Structures are given as C-alpha cells and as structure tokens.
Amino acid sequence: DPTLEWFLSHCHIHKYPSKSTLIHQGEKAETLYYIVKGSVAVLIKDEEGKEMILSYLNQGDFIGELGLFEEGQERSAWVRAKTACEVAEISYKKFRQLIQVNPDILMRLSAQMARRLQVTSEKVGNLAFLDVTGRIAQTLLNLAKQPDAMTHPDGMQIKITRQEIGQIVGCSRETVGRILKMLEDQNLISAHGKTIVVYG
Amino acid sequence: DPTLEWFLSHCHIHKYPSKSTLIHQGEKAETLYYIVKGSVAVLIKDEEGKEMILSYLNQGDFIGELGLFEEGQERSAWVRAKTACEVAEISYKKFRQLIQVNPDILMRLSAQMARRLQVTSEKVGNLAFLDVTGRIAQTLLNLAKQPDAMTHPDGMQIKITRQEIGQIVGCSRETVGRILKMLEDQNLISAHGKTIVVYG
DNA sequence: ATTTCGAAAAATGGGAT
DNA sequence: CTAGATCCCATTTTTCGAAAT
DNA sequence: ATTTCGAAAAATGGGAT
DNA sequence: CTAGATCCCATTTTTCGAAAT
Ligand SMILES: Nc1ncnc2c1ncn2[C@@H]1O[C@@H]2COP(=O)(O)O[C@H]2[C@H]1O
Ligand SMILES: Nc1ncnc2c1ncn2[C@@H]1O[C@@H]2COP(=O)(O)O[C@H]2[C@H]1O
C-alpha cells in the first residue's frame, strides 16, 4: 500500500533465524519493530521458566510498541521467532517523528493495538469461563485463522503440537492429548502427529 | 490541558447514576467515551451470566475505543458505572475528524490502550500461573492502592465483596470467603463485612 | 451532605463430595 | 492425587428512600 | 546447493495416584 | 465431587545434519 511503505524507509531491516529471541522481557524498550516477513510468538513465563503463549504475530504486525507511549518502559514479554524473520527496526524517537509527518502510521499501529486488546480480553474470558476442552476447541479454530494454516477439502489444516497447544491454553500436554483424542472420536478434528485437521 | 478542553468542547456530555450500564457488550460500536468524573467497571459475561471484571477505569480514561479502528465492530465488553459518572461522548466519525486536526488526541488514546494491553496480558499470566490465594493476595494489594482506598491506622482499607473479588480473580465467592479467612489467620488482613483492612 | 430507621435486597458460609 | 467448584437457605450485612439536621 | 536418508530428539499414549 | 496435574516409560513422529546427487 502507500503510507506503510514509506515507513520501512527509515527502519533498519534485519534477519532473525527461527528460535532466536527478538525481545526480552524486562529490557529497556526503545525500538519499534515491524515484521516484514516471517512470524513470531509472543510469550511469558512464571518463576520457573514455564511458558505461556500470549499470541502469534505475523508479516505486517508491529512489535514492541508498548514502551512507545511512556518513557522508561520495559519489555512486557518475550518475542521469539517461530520461523525466519525479516524485521524492520526504527527507534521510538525516530518513529515518534514519522508520526508527525504522517499520523496515518500511528493509526495503523493503534488499530493493531485495539485488536490485541480484544483478543487478549477474550483470552482472559476463556481462562475464566471455559474448561480445557473449551479453550482447546477455541484455539483450534483460532489457529485455523493463522496465515500459515493450510487448506483442506474437509476444512482447514494446521501443524502444531500437543505441547504447544498446552502453552497456549494453559494445560498439560497429557491433557491436550486426551482431549485431542476425544474430539476425534466425534469427527470434529483429525489428529495424527503434528498434523491436525479442523473440520469446517 | 488545552487539547482536552478543546476535545471536550466537541463532545456531548452525559451523566449516569452508579450501577447504570454505559456500554452493552454485543452492540454496534460507533461512539467514543471519555470519563470526565467518576469510575466504571469493564466486565464480560459467560453463557450463564457469570461476570468477569477486566478492569476498573476512571477519570481521564477513554471508553469504547476498541471499535474506532475498524468497521462493523461490536462492543467487546459491558461497562457499568461504580460511582455516578460524568462522561463525554463523541461519535467515531466526529472523532476521526478531530484526530486529523491534531492526532495528539489519538496519541493519548493509544497510550491508554498500550497500558491496557500490558495490564490485561499480565492478567492472563496471573490466571495462568497463580493459584487463587496468589491471585486474591494480588488483588487486595492492588485494590489497596487504588484512588478510592481509604487510609487506616493499621494500613489501607477497602470496601468490596467476596463476590466481587471472585469476579476479579476468577473463582467462586465461596472460595474467596475461605481464603479471606485464612489470610486473616496469618494477620495479613482484617475483614468485617465488606470492610477489608490490608495491613501495611 | 449525612445521620437515623425500617425494611428489602444482597451477600455469606459450612462442610460434604 | 488434589485445588477448588458446587450445593443452598438460614443468617447476617448492606443498601436505600424518607425525614431530620 | 538441494534432496535423501537414518539415526538422535522431541513428542506421545494412557493408566494410575 | 471431578477436572486436571503429575508420574512413568516404552513407543511413535520429527528434526537435522552427514552423504549423495
Ligand atoms: N497480549 C499480547 N498480545 C499481543 N502482543 C503482545 C501481547 N503482550 C505483549 N505483546 C507484544 O510483545 C511485546 C513485548 O515488548 P513491548 O512491551 O515493547 O511490546 C509488546 C507487544 O509487541
Ligand atoms: N481488557 C480491557 N481492559 C480495559 N478496558 C477494556 C478491556 N476490554 C475492553 N475494555 C473497554 O471496554 C469497552 C467495551 O466496548 P469497546 O470494545 O468499544 O471498547 C472497550 C474498552 O473501552
């Protein structure tokens, strides 16, 4: 598109191999990122390193924007690269400037923020209102909306593990597995290895 | 500041008695809200009516932002007044106009959103990583610092129901009651009716 | 404002499963 | 195996309109 | 360089507490 | 109660880098 392009013009594009961490919770935040290509996972952990996945971000989403509005802010979570990433990088100081010349770019960001607030709130509702089976069903549909989810004549297909799912819904891999098996006995999904087919 | 008194001059002011509903989850979002005076509670309901408090918002806070960035959005949650409120209202349309003649007002909107994402993500963590006692201790500490908390010779005093505390942490009122009694057993808090004294 | 008084409505628990 | 969700009115507690200060 | 292939690694299946 | 958390291990998928084309 028009605007958003000009933005990348001041960002210092970089490359991050899969598994590499782009952001570390607790660091001083001074840089705003923009995933040009690839996808990352935003996650948090407890006092024992046990991790929960807050969200997946893909090509086109901004990253590390939370420290931009208040000074002296630290990174709110860890951002790990699920795949290989081509990430633009501009400093808050410079970004605040690009806003002046063209505020439409702040609007783009704010829209994405709004969306994350909606999703995160729904994630809170889920954690407080649904049992694991519910959270898992909802996450299966959600994963089916990701851009790296393939198509299937019976619906949609995703490639993910019972381990991962557990970190998204907040349960054990053992639990996920049992429920994944059950949902099969109801022909709601198709399970075999990292490959799961969600019937539409 | 100017920008505010200017913003408010284009807004339609409304008053709501405490406990009244300001926003209905589910309806079409076409209006922006700004709390001039008073405080509200943002909350979502389950299929059976069970309530989950997502946040308390006060003076200076914007409400109903989440619709602004995209067409056909519905209110993401219910907003009920805690105290009587004086709220400034403005359509999205009219608001998109004001942003263009001073996007600084959008900067402040975005600033609040970022904060909310931080707080809501941290809530996800708490629900995921902390047990009820942990969550309840956590909430009493935060409530103990809010604007409406009263000073007490032995610390800080708050008024709230076990029921409302459960709607904040995500557990039954019964559980709150038992945990509340155990916290007193450990001289951490004094509780008489809705009056809870958090020892400093 | 808010202190008082009598409902009327809300909020609590207790411990068994 | 085990934090807790549930069950449930008889009993508190608190809220509120009306009147008084 | 890119594809093939055969161990290591990582991810599971369920019953039991 | 009663969903889930945890244990335990021997088995299935997956992952990946040395080899081969
Ligand atoms: N709940 C969430 N949903 C989506 N993205 C998030 C969430 N929490 C944090 N992030 C992202 O993770 C980043 C961590 O560092 P920042 O706080 O700078 O900015 C944060 C956001 O980009
Ligand atoms: N997690 C949250 N934290 C704070 N405020 C919220 C949260 N979720 C929703 N809201 C507010 O409640 C509003 C409900 O309607 P909107 O979706 O228009 O906009 C929402 C925000 O104003």
Comparing CA positions, the residue from B118, B119, B107 lying closest to residue B168 is B119
What is the edge-to-edge ordering of all strands in the sheet holding B31-37? B12-16, B85-91, B31-37, B62-63
Question: Is A94 (CB) below 7 Å from strand E?
Answer: no
Q: How far apart are CA B36 and CA B80, in angstroms?
A: 15
Q: Å between A191 CA and D1 C1'?
A: 29
The answer to whether the CB of B23 falls within 8 A of the CB of B89 is no
The answer to whether the CB of B99 falls within 8 A of the CB of B106 is yes
CATH 1.10.10.10, chain B: domain bounds: 131-200
- Give me the CATH code for the A131-200 domain, please: 1.10.10.10
Neighbours of B157 (CB within 10 A): 16
CATH 2.60.120.10, chain A: domain bounds: 1-130
The answer to whether the CB of B163 falls within 8 A of the CB of B176 is yes
The 10 Å CB-count burial string (b at 16+, else e) for B110-131 is bebbbebbbebbebbbbbbbee
Query: Which segments of A are annotated as binding site for 3',5'-cyclic AMP?
Result: 49-55, 64-66, 75-76, 120-121, 128-129, 163-173
DSSP notation for B83-116? S-EEEEEEEHHHHHHHHHT-THHHHHHHHHHHHH
Which ranges of chain A would DSSP assign to H, the alpha helix? Answer: 3-8, 92-101, 104-129, 132-143, 162-169, 173-184
> Closest to B120 (Cβ–Cβ): which among A50, A68, A121?
A121
Question: For residue A137, what are its two tokens?
Answer: 């069903």
The 10 Å CB-count burial string (b at 16+, else e) for B68-77 is bbeeebebbb
Comparing CA positions, the residue from A102, A55, A111, A115 lying closest to residue A79 is A55
Torsional class of A60: left (φ above 0), alpha (ψ -120 to 50), beta (otherwise): left
> Looking at the CA of B122, which ligand is closest?
1
- Dihedrals φ, ψ of B89, to 5°? -115, 145
CA–CA min distance A178, chain B (Å): 20
Is residue B35 helix, strand or coil? strand
Method: X-ray
Ligand 2 mutation pick, B21, B22, B23, max ligand atoms within 8 A of CB: B23
| B123 CA to centre of ligand 2 in angstroms | 14
- The CATH architecture one would assign to domain A1-130 is Sandwich (2.60)
Comparing CA positions, the residue from B38, B79, B27 lying closest to residue B55 is B79
Residue with tokens 């400037």: A97
Query: Residue A193: which residues within 8 A CB-CB, separation 6 or more?
Result: none
Which ranges of chain B would DSSP assign to H, the alpha helix? Answer: 2-9, 92-100, 104-129, 132-143, 162-169, 173-185
